[PDB]
Amino acid sequence: SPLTASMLASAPPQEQKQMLGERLFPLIQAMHPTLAGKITGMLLEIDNSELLHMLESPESLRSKVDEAVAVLQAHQAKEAAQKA
């Protein structure tokens, strides 16, 4: 399942995101099973070069996922509080 730049090359940008997402998802899911789809979607908006790096750097992925979880939680809780 290792991903190369050559695999991404000349493929539609949407499909590059799917390719990256398929590799990121099991890792992100391991970290936060209940948030896996959402956190992966958030991370997939990042530049592909940075995503490829994250796939090779567990600490980098961990840092970015920690950030996404904090951002997602705050967004959801703020929106709920506004309507409560």
């Binding site: 998802f25 789809g37 997939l44 908006e45 950030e67 996404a68 959801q76």
Partner: peptide, 16 residues
């Protein structure tokens, strides 16, 4: 700059 309104990623996996 992360977007909490980002679309959910849907893996080509089995669900459930």
């Amino acid at each position: 700059n992360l977007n909490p309104n980002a679309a959910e990623f849907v893996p080509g996996v089995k669900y459930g």
